[PDB]
Amino acid sequence: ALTFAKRLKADTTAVHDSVDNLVMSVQPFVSKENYIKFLKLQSVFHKAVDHIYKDAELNKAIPELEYMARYDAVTQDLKDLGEEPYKFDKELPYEAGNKAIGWLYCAEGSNLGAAFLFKHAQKLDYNGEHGARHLAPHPDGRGKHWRAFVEHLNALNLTPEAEAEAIQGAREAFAFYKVVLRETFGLAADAEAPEGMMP
Ligand code: HEM
């Protein structure tokens, strides 16, 4: 692939689809109880990247980055559902450097692709003002926002060597998402969606 952002996508599409499949297999919308499990999982992931969204160096390369964070929104969704802020039971990742750029790609891309989840949350009467605030589209549009973000990512002009570390970071962010999902939904370590399932 000819660009950093495209290489990130290429190298992480298989694991991304494993995440999509696993999230859907545990039935996040089957009940309020399961949706709360989903919100807990989302809380941990978005907390884990909070310090990256606020990173001073990255905010100088990517204007207004700190404001793209969704942790506050997920935490308000929890409140809406009658829950207090959720705290992970285990130590949370606090990644840095090139690898942290990969975590940032993973988190920011998750908003890009949150339309399907937002659609299904709406069936439960949860919308951008109550219960599904964290899934609502960027006010400028999901795509407009992502393409801009994508420009800034490519413009970091990471050397190929630093790109490798960033891509490894993205692999690790996806893997952590599934570790959290499993602990949260009561699955075994390394549990996956039924084999052969397609997003
Ligand atoms: C069942 C849940 C999920 C579904 C159905 C889903 C679906 C999608 C879709 C359709 C896109 C393409 C959107 C577009 O191009 O307009 C996308 C992109 C992406 N998603 Fe997901 N996703 C889910 C969960 C996640 C999660 C939990 C993460 C991160 C932890 C994530 C990370 C990403 C990233 C980083 C991209 C950008 C790919 C790119 O580089 O173009 N997704 N997703």
Whose Cα sits closest to atom 25 in ligand 1?
A: 110
For the beta carbon of residue 97, count every other beta carbon within 10 angstroms: 12
CA 34 to centroid of ligand 1, rounded, Å? 20
Judge contact between 21 and 197, C-beta under 8 A: yes
Resolution (A): 1.5
Give me Rg for the CA atoms of the chain.
Answer: 16
Residue 136 phi, psi (nearest 5): -65, 150
Ligand-binding annotation for 16, yes or no, is: yes
Give how many domains the chain has, as a whole number.
1
CA angle 93, 30, 187 (to 5 degrees): 40
Q: How far is the CA of 157 from the centre of ligand 1 (A)?
A: 24
What CATH number is given to the structural domain containing 13? 1.20.910.10
Residue numbers of the domain that contains 80: 1-199
The answer to whether 80 and 170 are in contact (CB under 8 A) is: no
The residue type at 194 = P
Instruction: Using the Cα atoms of residue 80, residue 76, residue 116 and residue 184 in order, give the sign of their dihedral.
Output: negative
Is the beta carbon of 44 within 6 A of some atom in ligand 1? no
Was 9 annotated as part of a binding site?
yes
